[PDB]
Design a protein around this ligand. Structure first.
Ligand SMILES: [Zn+2]
Ligand SMILES: [Zn+2]
Ligand SMILES: [Zn+2]
Lengths: 461, 131, 284, 351
């Protein structure tokens, strides 16, 4: 988890304070925080007198009071609060801007931005655009995955992917295929897919029109609700418009055509901070949408399917014979080499497959599990929960296929004594260069380019 | 087994002579029935009151041919599928029947027909059974 | 790790009027609900939009408030409804009063109100097939006179607690009114593992609320903030009304007595007492 | 579409202060495979839950355990009040396995002495889980049965997949003739509630002695966790209750007074009963057309209770099991639940 929070906190306070104007964000980020934060924030939310510290520690009893640190670190980490060690104590209060940025929002303040959604005549249909972006939102996966349909045609979007370079494919030939990031691309479907990308916008977002609130606000304003109009008409900065253009271009925004309106709030924006139900021509029903068979017979077992996720699942198994709702494809010791041909371990595969395609394998989780949870100490010999038999073989083949590690560069060789190692190689294991730390080796390893602190101290020894 | 007496002598047979020579009866006629005449003769003791119940097994191959000589209520109580049972198939039915019967199987409502609500249903049903 | 809040609020117009008499007539419960009104919004903003529910106990009876009982058939637009939608019903219900209502004050619908929520909690809980929602409810009351302590509700309330435990749903109560701490309630919160604050009326307790009533839902690693001891020498000798600690519970009647009993016919069960045994009580 | 315990008719008397001695057959008969590890394991399994389940509805009732192996009566757990002690005593045995026949005659007599010490009001009561198909009795029985009656010892057995006259006689005799207590299961799921039904008290049409006042008191919590000490376990209990009369500490419990010998509960234990005292008439299903009440549950709030005309679905079931005495409706699960967990009829509560 990249934990967008981590991206968030990267910036200094003035920028943080810059952003806290848009109230919904303050609320949005409020959701982000661990509960203690959420808790104590309220505790300070409506008392306009900075407060000591031990009191808060005196709020918590024993075990769990570590989260206090995990709490207080976080808030301090982004410095929402302002410490005051005036009287030796810590007099504390939020960034009042942010605090009022909340309170105003919390009790109907002057939030024109967070309340930028100017509702209008609702022309939105449920199936209306339900995949209308979902197509573009799905096709991009294929276009990213590399498939029959040019679902990844966004020149900016592609240039984003190329700029993002998270995909392991031949950009020289144009490919940005399943790298580990591509594998990760397969990994975090919605929360991962959205966020994992969204930063790419920021990743590309460095050149012109910083306007981060007008950027971020365009996000959480989207993250707010399907207000449709009242902003896309006017209530958005030009940075919003480009973001609006980008959002629709990213698909993540439910903006219709004609380039003059308030775009609808596509479901994605809900999914952006949902962590809830996420599924959604006219046939759109799950959970069986992802349909497949998991078992120790090394094959495709597919009645239902996601007509891309299949070829996605193929990315570790050879397609041999497509049929209407089934395909002959043998996922075997041979097939797994492909995920290693890309290189990524199919370890993500395990739980995901133990999580996905079970819609077609629901009788499986009882033909296999038998709920072998409480009978654990009554039998020395459990039964396939969760099915490891191929997974062991996988884990077997895992090393068995991998079975090597290579290094390259120069080779430092035949050192002198136990300082350069136990002065500056556990210190190379303390300044992050080494590509081998074998103490007695008297020889150590890096990657050729990586010496800026490697031909520097052993000379000094 | 199926009871028999020709362990003994012409005493029956010599008697059978007159019996068979006069009455159109063969030894078997006498034989097959009379064993049954003694076979179920045991069984009638098994039940005293309609409260009671029990299991009545028969252990001989030839009983299969002998289904058609029972007292009527017996054979009515005898179902077809119980024919030529082996032990395994037998033990199950009792295993249930015991378990089942042991339940306080007291409908206390359908007993009107079978226990004839007193002075009323005999009045009722036999007024309806007046024909 | 979301949850569910289910406020339970009485509206005792007598007490609500007495609330004007109490302290000052400087703004009745109209202040309170206001303070409450926002308080929910936090709970909404708090978790991953974990749901809430409100049930109210008017004079003649009770009524769900938030969940918007079948009716047709700014403020982040999700808050804005929840309250102003509910507010309608509070007003719509507020329309429901008159002296005929004012005549049948023979009980306080409080207890039954509590029950309904539990049901409602179970209603959600039992349907809560996916990602089970731990949950807690909350009570408030303009504790006033005209009944220093109703006693019939004793039983049913206590039946709530047993359920609450089994339902694992803590309760919380915020009494505002005369300095008469409802042991019943105070016991309840303690047994239900909640809090209690017989605070005064004037303040807009949102300060209390966020602090004192945001704690449980899932968190509960944390010190309760209750008052002093919750002495559990329970209901007075029903015969007398004298709170008991050296009790005398009769028998199959289960009534609670002092040394008072008439030696016969438990003054809730027509059960003449074992005279020899009754005498054996005099053994001191 | 209904199977209702029609009328809640003690109607005024049920046996609260109980003294139940649970006895389990532990024989090779218990080692037959009708149940998965055996009957015996499921037994001890289903016994475990029982204890809380028992002590839940009966926080005022002592209880103890007996096993029956090798034709021997073998107490396992002294009759007491804590569940846990009882509860743990099972698991110990649960791993151990039965040996030798069940000697019913040994069982009761060990109980007969065992149940002597309890006061008169305490329902002197025993429950049996027989597993075998016969017994091995060291002494007489028909005489032995009578001795029980002389002591007013109700009994009840959970027959295995059979019926045996003597116990069938035993229950019948010991419940003053009027019998229902010889239940023998036909299905394992039945056994589940078979324990559960044993939880409640058990009068039907009683004879009435002098049911006396029960002396008792109530303790109060303490504060200083540091000042730890004890007076019933003599340990350093961080700090707990104190006798209203003896005024001595005690490990937290509904226990008796280890200092001046009286019963000390809080009250909730009493409250825990009363639903047993006056339960509720069942919520009645509604007519398939005449209901016409709100399209939303009362107790819960579920819009349906019907189907708004769905051919063979709306007329299929008037999902409106509803109360009589308050005459207010109620949801399906609600009535299922309000009759189950908390009894406290909401509609009948508020009027
Ligand atoms: Zn002790
Ligand atoms: Zn004492
Ligand atoms: Zn009712």
């Amino acid at each position: 988890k990249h934990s967008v929070t981590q991206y968030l906190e990267e910036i200094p306070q003035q920028v943080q304070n810059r952003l806290y104007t848009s109230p919904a964000t303050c609320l949005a980020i409020y959701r982000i925080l661990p509960p203690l934060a959420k808790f104590f924030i309220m505790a300070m939310v409506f008392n306009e007198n900075e407060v000591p510290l031990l009191d808060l520690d005196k709020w918590v009893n024993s075990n769990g009071k570590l989260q206090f640190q995990n709490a207080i670190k976080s808030m301090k980490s982004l410095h929402l609060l302002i410490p005051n060690k005036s009287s030796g104590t810590l007099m504390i209060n939020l960034n009042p801007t942010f605090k009022i940025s909340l309170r105003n929002a919390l009790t109907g303040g002057e939030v024109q931005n967070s309340f930028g959604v100017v509702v209008e005549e609702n022309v939105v249909s449920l199936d209306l655009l339900d995949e209308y972006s979902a197509n573009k939102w799905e096709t991009i996966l294929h276009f990213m995955v590399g498939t029959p349909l040019a679902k990844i045609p966004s020149e900016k979007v592609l240039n984003l992917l190329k700029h993002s370079k998270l995909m392991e494919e031949v950009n020289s030939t144009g490919e940005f295929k399943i790298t580990n990031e591509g594998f990760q691309f397969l990994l975090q479907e919605i929360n991962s897919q959205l966020w994992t990308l969204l930063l790419q916008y920021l990743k590309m977002i460095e050149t012109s029109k910083m306007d981060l609130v007008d950027v971020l606000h365009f996000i959480f304003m989207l993250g707010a609700l399907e207000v449709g109009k009242a902003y896309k008409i006017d209530a958005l900065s030009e940075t919003q418009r480009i973001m609006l253009q980008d959002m629709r271009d990213y698909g993540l925004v439910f903006q219709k055509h004609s380039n003059d309106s308030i775009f609808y709030p596509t479901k994605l924006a809900l999914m952006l901070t949902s962590d809830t139900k996420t599924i959604r021509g006219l046939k759109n029903q799950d959970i069986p949408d992802g349909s497949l068979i998991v078992e120790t017979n090394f094959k495709i077992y597919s009645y239902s399917n996601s007509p891309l996720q299949i070829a996605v699942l193929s990315l570790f198994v050879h397609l041999k014979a497509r049929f209407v709702n089934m395909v002959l494809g043998q996922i075997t010791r041979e097939s797994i080499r492909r995920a290693l041909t890309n290189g990524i371990t199919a370890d993500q595969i395990i739980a995901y497959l133990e999580t996905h395609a079970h819609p077609q394998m629901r009788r499986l989780a009882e033909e296999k599990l038998e709920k072998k949870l409480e009978l654990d100490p009554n039998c020395k010999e459990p039964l396939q929960v969760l099915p490891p038999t191929v997974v062991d073989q996988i884990r077997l083949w895992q090393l068995e296929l991998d079975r090597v590690i290579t290094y390259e560069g120069s080779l430092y060789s035949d050192f002198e004594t136990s300082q350069e190692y136990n002065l500056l190689s556990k210190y190379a294991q303390d300044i992050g260069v080494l590509l081998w730390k074998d103490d007695k080796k008297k020889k150590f390893f890096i990657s050729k380019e990586g010496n800026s602190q490697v031909l520097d101290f052993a000379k000094r020894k | 087994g199926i009871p028999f007496q020709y362990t003994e002598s012409r005493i029956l047979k010599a008697r059978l002579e007159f019996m068979r020579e006069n009455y159109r009866i063969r030894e078997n006629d006498f034989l097959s029935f009379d064993a049954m005449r003694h076979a179920a003769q045991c069984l009638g003791r098994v039940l005293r009151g309609k409260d009671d119940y029990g299991v009545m097994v028969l252990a001989d191959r030839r009983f299969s041919r002998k289904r058609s000589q029972l007292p009527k209520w017996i054979a009515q109580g005898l179902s077809d599928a119980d024919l030529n049972l082996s032990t395994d198939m037998a033990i199950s039915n009792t295993k249930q029947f015991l378990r089942t019967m042991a339940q306080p199987t007291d409908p206390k409502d359908q007993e009107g027909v079978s226990v004839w609500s007193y002075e009323d249903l005999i009045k009722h049903q036999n007024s309806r059974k007046d024909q | 790790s979301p949850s569910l809040l289910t406020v339970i609020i009485e509206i005792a117009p007598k007490l609500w009027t007495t609330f004007d008499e109490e302290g000052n007539e400087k703004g009745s419960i109209i202040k309170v609900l206001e303070a409450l009104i926002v308080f929910l919004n936090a709970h909404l903003a708090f978790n991953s939009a974990n749901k809430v529910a409100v049930i109210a106990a008017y004079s003649q009876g009770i009524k769900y408030l938030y969940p918007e009982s079948t009716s047709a058939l700014x403020x982040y637009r999700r808050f804005r409804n929840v309250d102003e939608t509910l507010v309608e019903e509070i007003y719509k219900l507020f329309e429901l009063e008159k002296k005929q209502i004012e005549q049948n004050s023979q009980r306080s619908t409080l207890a039954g109100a509590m029950s309904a929520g539990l049901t409602y909690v179970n209603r959600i809980s039992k349907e809560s097939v996916t990602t089970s929602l731990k949950s807690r409810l909350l009570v408030l009351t303009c504790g006033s006179g005209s009944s220093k302590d109703e006693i019939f509700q004793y039983i049913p309330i206590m039946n709530c607690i047993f359920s609450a435990t089994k339902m694992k749903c803590p309760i919380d109560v915020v009494k505002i009114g005369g300095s008469k701490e409802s042991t019943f309630l105070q016991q309840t919160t303690d047994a239900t593992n909640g809090v209690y604050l017989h605070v005064e009326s004037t303040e807009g307790l949102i300060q209390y609320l966020a602090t004192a009533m945001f704690i449980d839902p899932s968190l509960r690693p944390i010190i309760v903030k209750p008052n002093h001891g919750s002495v559990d020498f329970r209901t007075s000798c029903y015969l007398t009304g004298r709170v008991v600690a050296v009790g005398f519970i009769c028998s199959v009647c289960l009534c609670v007595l002092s040394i008072i009993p008439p030696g016969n016919k438990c003054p809730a069960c027509d059960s003449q007492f074992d005279e020899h045994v009754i005498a054996k009580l005099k053994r001191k | 579409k209904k199977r209702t315990a029609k009328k809640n008719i003690t109607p005024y008397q049920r046996g609260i202060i109980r003294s139940l001695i649970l006895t389990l057959d532990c024989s090779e008969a218990m080692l037959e495979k009708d149940l998965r590890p055996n009957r015996h394991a499921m037994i001890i399994q289903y016994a475990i839950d029982f204890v809380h389940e028992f002590f839940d509805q009966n926080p005022i009732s002592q209880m103890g355990i007996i096993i029956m192996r090798n034709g021997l009566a073998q107490l396992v757990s002294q009759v007491s009040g804590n569940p846990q002690d009882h509860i743990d005593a099972l698991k110990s045995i649960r791993k151990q396995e039965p040996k030798g026949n069940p000697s019913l005659q040994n069982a009761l007599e060990m109980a007969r002495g065992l149940l002597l010490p309890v006061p008169a009001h305490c329902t002197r009561e025993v429950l049996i889980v027989f597993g075998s198909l016969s017994t091995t009795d060291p002494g007489d029985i028909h005489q032995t049965i009578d001795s029980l009656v002389s002591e007013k010892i109700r009994v009840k057995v959970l027959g295995l997949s059979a019926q045996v006259a003597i116990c069938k006689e035993l229950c019948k005799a010991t419940n003053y003739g009027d019998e229902s207590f010889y239940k023998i299961l036909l299905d394992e799921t039945h056994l589940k509630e078979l324990f559960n039904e044993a939880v409640t008290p058990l009068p039907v049409n009683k004879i009435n002695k002098g049911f006396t006042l029960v002396k008792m008191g109530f303790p109060t919590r303490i504060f200083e966790d540091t000042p730890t000490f004890c007076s019933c376990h003599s340990k350093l209990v961080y700090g707990g209750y104190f006798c209203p009369n003896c005024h001595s500490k005690v490990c937290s419990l509904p226990t008796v007074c280890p200092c001046c010998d009286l019963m000390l509960i809080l009250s909730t234990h009493l409250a825990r009963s009363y639903h047993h005292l006056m339960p509720l008439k069942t919520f009645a299903e509604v007519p398939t057309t005449e209901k016409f009440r709100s399209e939303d549950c009362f107790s819960c709030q579920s819009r349906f209770p019907x189907x708004x005309x769905x051919x063979x679905x709306x007329x299929x079931x008037x999902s409106r099991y509803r109360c009589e005495d308050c005459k207010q409706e109620f949801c399906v699960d609600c009535d299922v639940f309000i009759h189950e967990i908390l009894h406290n009829c909401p509609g009948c509560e508020s009027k």
